[PDB]
Structure formats: C-alpha cells, structure tokens
PDB file of C-alpha atoms and ligand atoms in Angstrom:
ATOM      1  CA  UNK A   1       0.292   0.144  -0.226  1.00  0.00           C
ATOM      2  CA  UNK A   2       0.971   3.706  -0.913  1.00  0.00           C
ATOM      3  CA  UNK A   3       1.320   4.436   3.179  1.00  0.00           C
ATOM      4  CA  UNK A   4       1.253   2.548   6.348  1.00  0.00           C
ATOM      5  CA  UNK A   5      -2.440   1.602   7.505  1.00  0.00           C
ATOM      6  CA  UNK A   6      -1.221   3.313  11.173  1.00  0.00           C
ATOM      7  CA  UNK A   7      -1.972   1.780  14.891  1.00  0.00           C
ATOM      8  CA  UNK A   8      -5.010   0.464  15.570  1.00  0.00           C
ATOM      9  CA  UNK A   9      -7.466   2.231  16.676  1.00  0.00           C
ATOM     10  CA  UNK A  10      -5.250   4.949  17.287  1.00  0.00           C
ATOM     11  CA  UNK A  11      -2.974   3.270  19.545  1.00  0.00           C
ATOM     12  CA  UNK A  12      -0.157   4.807  19.095  1.00  0.00           C
ATOM     13  CA  UNK A  13       1.715   7.219  21.501  1.00  0.00           C
ATOM     14  CA  UNK A  14       1.437  11.048  20.673  1.00  0.00           C
ATOM     15  CA  UNK A  15       4.844  12.586  20.384  1.00  0.00           C
ATOM     16  CA  UNK A  16       5.901  15.993  19.412  1.00  0.00           C
ATOM     17  CA  UNK A  17       8.071  18.142  17.607  1.00  0.00           C
ATOM     18  CA  UNK A  18       9.226  21.157  19.748  1.00  0.00           C
ATOM     19  CA  UNK A  19      10.846  23.981  17.249  1.00  0.00           C
ATOM     20  CA  UNK A  20      12.779  26.306  19.826  1.00  0.00           C
ATOM     21  CA  UNK A  21      16.242  25.702  21.498  1.00  0.00           C
ATOM     22  CA  UNK A  22      17.050  22.045  23.096  1.00  0.00           C
ATOM     23  CA  UNK A  23      18.798  21.418  26.597  1.00  0.00           C
ATOM     24  CA  UNK A  24      20.324  18.874  27.629  1.00  0.00           C
ATOM     25  CA  UNK A  25      18.369  16.931  30.509  1.00  0.00           C
ATOM     26  CA  UNK A  26      15.422  16.661  32.548  1.00  0.00           C
ATOM     27  CA  UNK A  27      13.873  19.392  34.873  1.00  0.00           C
ATOM     28  CA  UNK A  28      13.644  18.363  38.503  1.00  0.00           C
ATOM     29  CA  UNK A  29      10.617  19.948  40.792  1.00  0.00           C
ATOM     30  CA  UNK A  30      10.936  19.473  44.401  1.00  0.00           C
ATOM     31  CA  UNK A  31       7.211  19.549  46.504  1.00  0.00           C
ATOM     32  CA  UNK A  32       6.577  18.772  50.409  1.00  0.00           C
ATOM     33  CA  UNK A  33       6.044  15.304  51.653  1.00  0.00           C
ATOM     34  CA  UNK A  34       5.708  14.712  55.161  1.00  0.00           C
ATOM     35  CA  UNK A  35       8.341  12.350  57.403  1.00  0.00           C
ATOM     36  CA  UNK A  36       6.807   9.122  57.930  1.00  0.00           C
ATOM     37  CA  UNK A  37       3.838   9.933  56.236  1.00  0.00           C
ATOM     38  CA  UNK A  38       2.664   6.483  54.733  1.00  0.00           C
ATOM     39  CA  UNK A  39      -1.069   7.242  53.331  1.00  0.00           C
ATOM     40  CA  UNK A  40      -0.532  10.481  50.937  1.00  0.00           C
ATOM     41  CA  UNK A  41       1.715   8.951  48.082  1.00  0.00           C
ATOM     42  CA  UNK A  42      -0.423   5.363  48.023  1.00  0.00           C
ATOM     43  CA  UNK A  43      -2.796   7.355  45.894  1.00  0.00           C
ATOM     44  CA  UNK A  44      -3.165   8.151  42.274  1.00  0.00           C
ATOM     45  CA  UNK A  45      -4.437  11.875  42.553  1.00  0.00           C
ATOM     46  CA  UNK A  46      -1.775  12.560  44.299  1.00  0.00           C
ATOM     47  CA  UNK A  47       1.286  10.956  42.258  1.00  0.00           C
ATOM     48  CA  UNK A  48      -0.272  12.042  39.085  1.00  0.00           C
ATOM     49  CA  UNK A  49      -1.029  15.902  39.544  1.00  0.00           C
ATOM     50  CA  UNK A  50      -2.126  16.523  43.761  1.00  0.00           C
ATOM     51  CA  UNK A  51       1.963  16.435  44.782  1.00  0.00           C
ATOM     52  CA  UNK A  52       2.095  20.059  42.819  1.00  0.00           C
ATOM     53  CA  UNK A  53      -0.692  21.467  45.284  1.00  0.00           C
ATOM     54  CA  UNK A  54       1.731  20.949  48.398  1.00  0.00           C
ATOM     55  CA  UNK A  55       4.431  23.748  48.696  1.00  0.00           C
ATOM     56  CA  UNK A  56       7.248  23.853  46.333  1.00  0.00           C
ATOM     57  CA  UNK A  57      10.681  23.690  47.587  1.00  0.00           C
ATOM     58  CA  UNK A  58      12.551  24.690  44.222  1.00  0.00           C
ATOM     59  CA  UNK A  59      14.184  23.229  41.476  1.00  0.00           C
ATOM     60  CA  UNK A  60      17.270  21.904  39.362  1.00  0.00           C
ATOM     61  CA  UNK A  61      17.149  21.373  35.444  1.00  0.00           C
ATOM     62  CA  UNK A  62      19.700  19.867  32.521  1.00  0.00           C
ATOM     63  CA  UNK A  63      19.875  16.581  34.556  1.00  0.00           C
ATOM     64  CA  UNK A  64      20.434  13.415  32.696  1.00  0.00           C
ATOM     65  CA  UNK A  65      21.337  10.876  36.036  1.00  0.00           C
ATOM     66  CA  UNK A  66      17.752  10.374  36.916  1.00  0.00           C
ATOM     67  CA  UNK A  67      17.788   6.860  39.375  1.00  0.00           C
ATOM     68  CA  UNK A  68      17.627   8.084  43.050  1.00  0.00           C
ATOM     69  CA  UNK A  69      19.946   6.270  45.803  1.00  0.00           C
ATOM     70  CA  UNK A  70      19.690   8.603  49.034  1.00  0.00           C
ATOM     71  CA  UNK A  71      21.386   6.439  51.758  1.00  0.00           C
ATOM     72  CA  UNK A  72      21.118   7.882  55.372  1.00  0.00           C
ATOM     73  CA  UNK A  73      23.899   8.616  57.652  1.00  0.00           C
ATOM     74  CA  UNK A  74      25.112   6.313  60.325  1.00  0.00           C
ATOM     75  CA  UNK A  75      26.988   8.724  62.919  1.00  0.00           C
ATOM     76  CA  UNK A  76      29.626   6.054  63.836  1.00  0.00           C
ATOM     77  CA  UNK A  77      32.500   6.336  66.289  1.00  0.00           C
ATOM     78  CA  UNK A  78      35.385   7.497  63.180  1.00  0.00           C
ATOM     79  CA  UNK A  79      33.055  10.288  61.911  1.00  0.00           C
ATOM     80  CA  UNK A  80      29.372   9.957  59.603  1.00  0.00           C
ATOM     81  CA  UNK A  81      29.161   7.970  56.509  1.00  0.00           C
ATOM     82  CA  UNK A  82      26.119   6.779  54.271  1.00  0.00           C
ATOM     83  CA  UNK A  83      24.996   3.838  55.465  1.00  0.00           C
ATOM     84  CA  UNK A  84      23.804   1.139  52.777  1.00  0.00           C
ATOM     85  CA  UNK A  85      20.839   0.251  53.540  1.00  0.00           C
ATOM     86  CA  UNK A  86      21.878  -3.783  52.873  1.00  0.00           C
ATOM     87  CA  UNK A  87      24.679  -3.210  55.672  1.00  0.00           C
ATOM     88  CA  UNK A  88      22.247  -2.198  58.591  1.00  0.00           C
ATOM     89  CA  UNK A  89      21.461  -4.332  61.513  1.00  0.00           C
ATOM     90  CA  UNK A  90      20.594  -4.489  64.636  1.00  0.00           C
ATOM     91  CA  UNK A  91      19.321  -1.433  66.238  1.00  0.00           C
ATOM     92  CA  UNK A  92      21.892  -0.061  64.619  1.00  0.00           C
ATOM     93  CA  UNK A  93      24.792  -0.597  63.307  1.00  0.00           C
ATOM     94  CA  UNK A  94      26.454  -0.130  59.598  1.00  0.00           C
ATOM     95  CA  UNK A  95      28.916  -2.451  58.554  1.00  0.00           C
ATOM     96  CA  UNK A  96      32.519  -1.731  58.689  1.00  0.00           C
ATOM     97  CA  UNK A  97      31.083   1.397  60.595  1.00  0.00           C
ATOM     98  CA  UNK A  98      30.036  -0.066  63.720  1.00  0.00           C
ATOM     99  CA  UNK A  99      26.375   1.188  66.045  1.00  0.00           C
ATOM    100  CA  UNK A 100      25.114   4.001  64.591  1.00  0.00           C
ATOM    101  CA  UNK A 101      23.920   6.928  67.093  1.00  0.00           C
ATOM    102  CA  UNK A 102      21.441   8.169  65.480  1.00  0.00           C
ATOM    103  CA  UNK A 103      18.135   7.779  64.828  1.00  0.00           C
ATOM    104  CA  UNK A 104      16.119   6.380  61.428  1.00  0.00           C
ATOM    105  CA  UNK A 105      12.947   7.956  62.190  1.00  0.00           C
ATOM    106  CA  UNK A 106      13.957  12.190  61.865  1.00  0.00           C
ATOM    107  CA  UNK A 107      13.999  14.114  58.522  1.00  0.00           C
ATOM    108  CA  UNK A 108      17.449  14.773  57.341  1.00  0.00           C
ATOM    109  CA  UNK A 109      19.233  17.364  54.561  1.00  0.00           C
ATOM    110  CA  UNK A 110      21.444  16.407  51.875  1.00  0.00           C
ATOM    111  CA  UNK A 111      22.357  17.590  47.871  1.00  0.00           C
ATOM    112  CA  UNK A 112      22.265  13.591  47.121  1.00  0.00           C
ATOM    113  CA  UNK A 113      19.413  14.383  45.398  1.00  0.00           C
ATOM    114  CA  UNK A 114      20.438  16.367  41.505  1.00  0.00           C
ATOM    115  CA  UNK A 115      22.330  18.349  43.778  1.00  0.00           C
ATOM    116  CA  UNK A 116      19.769  20.209  45.367  1.00  0.00           C
ATOM    117  CA  UNK A 117      19.649  21.010  49.253  1.00  0.00           C
ATOM    118  CA  UNK A 118      16.502  19.551  50.423  1.00  0.00           C
ATOM    119  CA  UNK A 119      15.389  16.462  52.954  1.00  0.00           C
ATOM    120  CA  UNK A 120      15.934  13.509  50.697  1.00  0.00           C
ATOM    121  CA  UNK A 121      13.955  10.578  53.835  1.00  0.00           C
ATOM    122  CA  UNK A 122      10.996  13.342  52.803  1.00  0.00           C
ATOM    123  CA  UNK A 123       9.919  14.699  50.225  1.00  0.00           C
ATOM    124  CA  UNK A 124       8.522  14.411  46.234  1.00  0.00           C
ATOM    125  CA  UNK A 125       9.844  15.201  43.498  1.00  0.00           C
ATOM    126  CA  UNK A 126       8.508  15.183  39.320  1.00  0.00           C
ATOM    127  CA  UNK A 127      11.896  14.638  36.682  1.00  0.00           C
ATOM    128  CA  UNK A 128      10.352  15.619  33.614  1.00  0.00           C
ATOM    129  CA  UNK A 129      11.617  16.012  29.535  1.00  0.00           C
ATOM    130  CA  UNK A 130      10.997  14.620  26.135  1.00  0.00           C
ATOM    131  CA  UNK A 131      12.764  11.448  25.324  1.00  0.00           C
ATOM    132  CA  UNK A 132      14.057  10.852  22.292  1.00  0.00           C
ATOM    133  CA  UNK A 133      14.114   7.338  20.736  1.00  0.00           C
ATOM    134  CA  UNK A 134      17.110   7.146  18.146  1.00  0.00           C
ATOM    135  CA  UNK A 135      16.135   3.696  17.526  1.00  0.00           C
ATOM    136  CA  UNK A 136      12.106   2.851  15.745  1.00  0.00           C
ATOM    137  CA  UNK A 137      10.759  -0.240  17.787  1.00  0.00           C
ATOM    138  CA  UNK A 138       9.822  -1.389  21.357  1.00  0.00           C
ATOM    139  CA  UNK A 139      11.387   0.616  24.671  1.00  0.00           C
ATOM    140  CA  UNK A 140      10.623  -1.219  27.992  1.00  0.00           C
ATOM    141  CA  UNK A 141      10.750   0.972  30.876  1.00  0.00           C
ATOM    142  CA  UNK A 142      11.647  -0.208  34.684  1.00  0.00           C
ATOM    143  CA  UNK A 143      12.151   0.798  37.801  1.00  0.00           C
ATOM    144  CA  UNK A 144      14.688  -2.103  39.480  1.00  0.00           C
ATOM    145  CA  UNK A 145      12.696  -1.808  43.178  1.00  0.00           C
ATOM    146  CA  UNK A 146      10.951   1.093  44.403  1.00  0.00           C
ATOM    147  CA  UNK A 147      11.859   2.932  48.311  1.00  0.00           C
ATOM    148  CA  UNK A 148       8.749   4.191  48.591  1.00  0.00           C
ATOM    149  CA  UNK A 149       6.236   5.286  45.514  1.00  0.00           C
ATOM    150  CA  UNK A 150       6.749   6.255  42.095  1.00  0.00           C
ATOM    151  CA  UNK A 151       5.266   6.644  38.290  1.00  0.00           C
ATOM    152  CA  UNK A 152       6.567   6.579  34.767  1.00  0.00           C
ATOM    153  CA  UNK A 153       4.319   7.914  32.265  1.00  0.00           C
ATOM    154  CA  UNK A 154       5.684   8.503  28.412  1.00  0.00           C
ATOM    155  CA  UNK A 155       3.512  10.432  25.628  1.00  0.00           C
ATOM    156  CA  UNK A 156       1.391  13.503  25.119  1.00  0.00           C
ATOM    157  CA  UNK A 157      -1.792  13.477  27.295  1.00  0.00           C
ATOM    158  CA  UNK A 158      -0.107  11.278  29.707  1.00  0.00           C
ATOM    159  CA  UNK A 159       2.889  12.804  31.120  1.00  0.00           C
ATOM    160  CA  UNK A 160       2.317  16.226  29.818  1.00  0.00           C
ATOM    161  CA  UNK A 161       1.106  18.390  26.700  1.00  0.00           C
ATOM    162  CA  UNK A 162       3.434  19.032  23.834  1.00  0.00           C
ATOM    163  CA  UNK A 163       5.607  22.162  23.949  1.00  0.00           C
ATOM    164  CA  UNK A 164       4.227  22.251  27.554  1.00  0.00           C
ATOM    165  CA  UNK A 165       6.565  21.069  29.645  1.00  0.00           C
ATOM    166  CA  UNK A 166       6.322  23.780  31.983  1.00  0.00           C
ATOM    167  CA  UNK A 167       2.737  23.797  32.888  1.00  0.00           C
ATOM    168  CA  UNK A 168       1.179  22.818  36.350  1.00  0.00           C
ATOM    169  CA  UNK A 169       0.676  18.665  36.168  1.00  0.00           C
ATOM    170  CA  UNK A 170      -2.006  17.149  33.794  1.00  0.00           C
ATOM    171  CA  UNK A 171      -4.076  14.730  35.643  1.00  0.00           C
ATOM    172  CA  UNK A 172      -3.683  11.563  33.829  1.00  0.00           C
ATOM    173  CA  UNK A 173      -3.696   8.142  35.639  1.00  0.00           C
ATOM    174  CA  UNK A 174      -2.710   6.005  32.947  1.00  0.00           C
ATOM    175  CA  UNK A 175       0.849   5.384  33.853  1.00  0.00           C
ATOM    176  CA  UNK A 176       3.793   3.484  31.838  1.00  0.00           C
ATOM    177  CA  UNK A 177       4.958   2.041  34.845  1.00  0.00           C
ATOM    178  CA  UNK A 178       2.739   1.780  38.473  1.00  0.00           C
ATOM    179  CA  UNK A 179       5.280   2.277  41.342  1.00  0.00           C
ATOM    180  CA  UNK A 180       2.711   3.525  43.458  1.00  0.00           C
ATOM    181  CA  UNK A 181       2.911   2.268  47.487  1.00  0.00           C
ATOM    182  CA  UNK A 182       0.405  -0.278  47.781  1.00  0.00           C
ATOM    183  CA  UNK A 183      -1.680   0.161  50.693  1.00  0.00           C
ATOM    184  CA  UNK A 184      -1.163  -3.340  52.218  1.00  0.00           C
ATOM    185  CA  UNK A 185       2.247  -2.879  51.782  1.00  0.00           C
ATOM    186  CA  UNK A 186       4.986  -3.702  48.898  1.00  0.00           C
ATOM    187  CA  UNK A 187       5.691  -4.770  45.167  1.00  0.00           C
ATOM    188  CA  UNK A 188       3.200  -2.715  43.199  1.00  0.00           C
ATOM    189  CA  UNK A 189       2.573  -5.432  40.341  1.00  0.00           C
ATOM    190  CA  UNK A 190       4.442  -4.593  37.599  1.00  0.00           C
ATOM    191  CA  UNK A 191       7.224  -2.110  37.400  1.00  0.00           C
ATOM    192  CA  UNK A 192       8.005  -2.323  33.983  1.00  0.00           C
ATOM    193  CA  UNK A 193       6.070  -0.367  30.502  1.00  0.00           C
ATOM    194  CA  UNK A 194       6.924  -0.769  27.236  1.00  0.00           C
ATOM    195  CA  UNK A 195       6.079   2.148  24.715  1.00  0.00           C
ATOM    196  CA  UNK A 196       6.674   1.434  20.947  1.00  0.00           C
ATOM    197  CA  UNK A 197       8.483   5.418  19.861  1.00  0.00           C
ATOM    198  CA  UNK A 198       9.261   5.797  16.369  1.00  0.00           C
ATOM    199  CA  UNK A 199      12.615   7.265  15.331  1.00  0.00           C
ATOM    200  CA  UNK A 200      13.507  10.888  15.901  1.00  0.00           C
ATOM    201  CA  UNK A 201      10.082  12.314  17.549  1.00  0.00           C
ATOM    202  CA  UNK A 202      10.332  13.669  21.258  1.00  0.00           C
ATOM    203  CA  UNK A 203       7.885  11.799  23.549  1.00  0.00           C
ATOM    204  CA  UNK A 204       7.204  13.578  27.037  1.00  0.00           C
ATOM    205  CA  UNK A 205       8.323  11.799  30.329  1.00  0.00           C
ATOM    206  CA  UNK A 206       7.522  12.612  33.493  1.00  0.00           C
ATOM    207  CA  UNK A 207       8.569   9.901  36.592  1.00  0.00           C
ATOM    208  CA  UNK A 208       7.258  10.928  40.042  1.00  0.00           C
ATOM    209  CA  UNK A 209       9.082  10.108  43.172  1.00  0.00           C
ATOM    210  CA  UNK A 210       7.697  10.249  46.797  1.00  0.00           C
ATOM    211  CA  UNK A 211       9.950   9.322  49.944  1.00  0.00           C
ATOM    212  CA  UNK A 212       8.401   9.197  53.369  1.00  0.00           C
ATOM    213  CA  UNK A 213      11.239   7.785  55.498  1.00  0.00           C
ATOM    214  CA  UNK A 214      14.750   7.092  55.609  1.00  0.00           C
ATOM    215  CA  UNK A 215      16.478   5.305  52.520  1.00  0.00           C
ATOM    216  CA  UNK A 216      14.819   6.150  49.023  1.00  0.00           C
ATOM    217  CA  UNK A 217      16.360   3.892  45.787  1.00  0.00           C
ATOM    218  CA  UNK A 218      14.427   4.067  42.194  1.00  0.00           C
ATOM    219  CA  UNK A 219      16.976   2.582  40.262  1.00  0.00           C
ATOM    220  CA  UNK A 220      15.567   3.456  35.851  1.00  0.00           C
ATOM    221  CA  UNK A 221      16.591   1.935  33.208  1.00  0.00           C
ATOM    222  CA  UNK A 222      15.036   1.749  29.510  1.00  0.00           C
ATOM    223  CA  UNK A 223      15.469  -1.757  27.017  1.00  0.00           C
ATOM    224  CA  UNK A 224      15.912  -0.400  23.301  1.00  0.00           C
ATOM    225  CA  UNK A 225      14.776  -1.858  20.757  1.00  0.00           C
ATOM    226  CA  UNK A 226      18.547  -3.274  19.738  1.00  0.00           C
ATOM    227  CA  UNK A 227      18.653  -5.431  23.378  1.00  0.00           C
ATOM    228  CA  UNK A 228      20.420  -3.368  24.848  1.00  0.00           C
ATOM    229  CA  UNK A 229      19.751  -1.237  28.253  1.00  0.00           C
ATOM    230  CA  UNK A 230      20.556   2.339  29.366  1.00  0.00           C
ATOM    231  CA  UNK A 231      20.947   1.900  33.484  1.00  0.00           C
ATOM    232  CA  UNK A 232      20.873   5.647  35.489  1.00  0.00           C
ATOM    233  CA  UNK A 233      22.563   8.247  33.304  1.00  0.00           C
ATOM    234  CA  UNK A 234      20.052   8.828  30.058  1.00  0.00           C
ATOM    235  CA  UNK A 235      22.789  11.101  28.407  1.00  0.00           C
ATOM    236  CA  UNK A 236      21.637  11.444  24.790  1.00  0.00           C
ATOM    237  CA  UNK A 237      18.631  10.765  25.568  1.00  0.00           C
ATOM    238  CA  UNK A 238      16.320  12.988  27.349  1.00  0.00           C
ATOM    239  CA  UNK A 239      16.008  16.792  26.443  1.00  0.00           C
ATOM    240  CA  UNK A 240      14.059  19.413  27.835  1.00  0.00           C
ATOM    241  CA  UNK A 241      12.395  22.816  25.626  1.00  0.00           C
ATOM    242  CA  UNK A 242      10.874  25.849  27.324  1.00  0.00           C
ATOM    243  CA  UNK A 243       7.294  25.817  27.257  1.00  0.00           C
ATOM    244  CA  UNK A 244       5.620  27.370  23.711  1.00  0.00           C
ATOM    245  CA  UNK A 245       2.096  27.040  23.926  1.00  0.00           C
ATOM    246  CA  UNK A 246       1.888  29.080  20.617  1.00  0.00           C
ATOM    247  CA  UNK A 247       3.476  26.914  18.272  1.00  0.00           C
ATOM    248  CA  UNK A 248       0.150  24.964  16.595  1.00  0.00           C
ATOM    249  CA  UNK A 249       2.099  22.114  15.008  1.00  0.00           C
ATOM    250  CA  UNK A 250       3.670  21.153  17.705  1.00  0.00           C
ATOM    251  CA  UNK A 251       1.703  17.373  19.076  1.00  0.00           C
ATOM    252  CA  UNK A 252       2.105  14.686  16.495  1.00  0.00           C
ATOM    253  CA  UNK A 253      -1.210  12.693  17.703  1.00  0.00           C
ATOM    254  CA  UNK A 254       0.293   9.846  15.481  1.00  0.00           C
ATOM    255  CA  UNK A 255       3.647   9.190  14.625  1.00  0.00           C
ATOM    256  CA  UNK A 256       2.920   5.742  12.951  1.00  0.00           C
ATOM    257  CA  UNK A 257       1.660   7.919   9.882  1.00  0.00           C
ATOM    258  CA  UNK A 258       3.300  11.076  10.275  1.00  0.00           C
TER     259      UNK A 258
HETATM  260  O1  LIG B 301       8.936   1.066  53.894  1.00  0.00           O
HETATM  261  C1  LIG B 301       8.665   1.954  54.867  1.00  0.00           C
HETATM  262  C2  LIG B 301      10.400   1.772  55.376  1.00  0.00           C
HETATM  263  O2  LIG B 301      10.844   0.982  55.728  1.00  0.00           O
HETATM  264  C3  LIG B 301      12.448   1.028  56.151  1.00  0.00           C
HETATM  265  O3  LIG B 301      12.622   1.998  56.924  1.00  0.00           O
HETATM  266  C4  LIG B 301      12.458   1.507  58.356  1.00  0.00           C
HETATM  267  C5  LIG B 301      13.455   2.872  59.488  1.00  0.00           C
HETATM  268  O4  LIG B 301      14.704   3.153  58.753  1.00  0.00           O
HETATM  269  C6  LIG B 301      12.190   3.629  59.734  1.00  0.00           C
HETATM  270  O5  LIG B 301      12.883   5.137  60.572  1.00  0.00           O
HETATM  271  C7  LIG B 301      11.019   3.479  60.203  1.00  0.00           C
HETATM  272  C8  LIG B 301       9.605   4.139  60.629  1.00  0.00           C
HETATM  273  O6  LIG B 301       8.927   4.081  60.802  1.00  0.00           O
HETATM  274  O7  LIG B 301       9.964   2.671  59.188  1.00  0.00           O
HETATM  275  C9  LIG B 301      11.308   1.171  59.174  1.00  0.00           C
HETATM  276  O8  LIG B 301      11.269   0.625  59.951  1.00  0.00           O
HETATM  277  C10 LIG B 301      13.159   1.655  55.248  1.00  0.00           C
HETATM  278  O9  LIG B 301      13.415   0.337  54.216  1.00  0.00           O
HETATM  279  C11 LIG B 301      12.437   2.522  54.484  1.00  0.00           C
HETATM  280  O10 LIG B 301      13.041   3.426  53.524  1.00  0.00           O
HETATM  281  C12 LIG B 301      10.749   2.594  54.104  1.00  0.00           C
HETATM  282  O11 LIG B 301      10.544   3.910  53.765  1.00  0.00           O
HETATM  283 CA1  LIG B 302      -3.887  16.500  24.862  1.00  0.00          CA
HETATM  284 CA1  LIG B 303      12.144   5.524  52.049  1.00  0.00          CA
HETATM  285 CL1  LIG B 304      30.214  -2.438  62.064  1.00  0.00          CL
HETATM  286 NA1  LIG B 305      21.012   2.618  48.744  1.00  0.00          NA
HETATM  287 NA1  LIG B 306      25.779  11.122  55.515  1.00  0.00          NA
END
C-alpha cells in the first residue's frame, strides 16, 4: 500500500516536534512531603498531579543521571558516613562502621538528590523532559525497585502536553509504570512498562517519586529496540524545551503516519 495503515484504533503514543532550543536533560521540581506519612503517596491522583498542590521547594534543570540512591547517615565512632541499606543491621549499626548513634526516624538534609539541598528522607520530586528514541521500535522502561512510591509516564497527554513541559501537571493516571506504594504493603504488581516509539520524535516523559522515611531508591532503566539496556545515565536520550504554547504544529497525534 502507498502508505502505512497506522496503529489500530489510534493506538500510537502521541509525540511532539518542539521547534525551540533544545536543552540536555530533565527538569526536577521538588515538593513538600511529610516525614513518616505512609498514606498520601498511595493515591493515584496524588502521584499524577496532587503533589504540586503542596509547597514547591525548588528545582534543578539539565539532569541526565536520573536514578535515586539515597542512603541515610550513620553517626559512627569514626565520623558520619552514608549507610547502604543492605549494610544496616541491629538497632542499629552499619557494616564496617559499628553502632550508629542517630535515629533512622528523623529528617535528614543533604544535596544527594541532584545537588538540591532538601530532605531526601521525606520529599516528592517530579522529573520532566522528552525522550528521543534513536531507533524505531519497542522500548521497555523499568524500575529495579521502588522505595517508597513512584510512577513513570510516557506520551503526549499522558506525561504532559506537547510544548508545555513547564505547566502544572495534567491529570492523567494512565501510567506507563505504576510503582505506587500499595495500601497493604510492598511490590506494586508491575514495575516495567513498554512503549512503541518512532525515531526522531520527542516523547514527553514524567517521573514522580516520593520518599516518606529513611532510604530512598529508584533505579531507572530502559531496554532499547536493539536489546541493549541504558541504566541511570540517560544522556543523549532526554531533553528539555521551554514552553511554547503558540507552536501550532507541535503535537503529533500519530507518529505511525506523520
Ligand atoms: O517501607 C517503609 C520504610 O521501611 C524502612 O524504614 C524503617 C526505618 O528506617 C524507619 O525509620 C521506620 C519509620 O517508622 O520504618 C522502618 O522501620 C526503609 O526501607 C524505608 O526506606 C522505608 O520507607
Ligand atoms: Ca491533550
Ligand atoms: Ca524510604
Ligand atoms: Cl560493623
Ligand atoms: Na542505597
Ligand atoms: Na552521610
């Protein structure tokens, strides 16, 4: 046939072609989240957009290394050092450091999250940008684990609106990865999600992540169509554009026939 038929029942993911100046990396916004609040982050509305109704703490731009690996301090006999969670023991010590005198249950201040000084123990963050596939095919995004709650969304009208990266969050709960902390306990059902992407189109990407206490962990990866995996460092794949709500042609509803 002269032309491709298109994905069935307009099933292609919406993408974008922003015409402005591209910037490397994602924007990270930080919002207040209460220490030891084990319920707010279990609501889909909160993780999709309600986080932005809490106080905005600040932001950092241009971030390409997007995984989270926050370790609380151990105040030890030889000084204060971050403790890998698997090395914590007893009530409590950190392997190779002895007993720790400090509480696992208080807020801690650090620049560990993207250089931004905040409380990684208790915070919500929103990562936004556009994913640029170099290859047409199936991409599988993953979280290796989630501590405490997280979502990943891909696509125009799902992550955010084309050419409108900096706007308040949209209300879609059609997450690509639903890593929301269950009300009962541990292990959302599925922490991978696959998206079919066409090379050279910009796909809106949003990650919302929350920690309520102590350790924070979100190892982000993507499996490319060629079978290789990109983990943590998304340089060359993720970009930002300043809003341009005037760019009439920015939205590509069906990259399968554009
Ligand atoms: O899954 C909840 C929480 O579990 C673990 O935190 C422990 C401790 O560090 C906290 O102070 C108390 C607060 O009541 O909870 C647990 O005993 C960690 O895996 C933590 O990261 C996680 O959020
Ligand atoms: Ca829309
Ligand atoms: Ca935690
Ligand atoms: Cl020890
Ligand atoms: Na860790
Ligand atoms: Na430390």
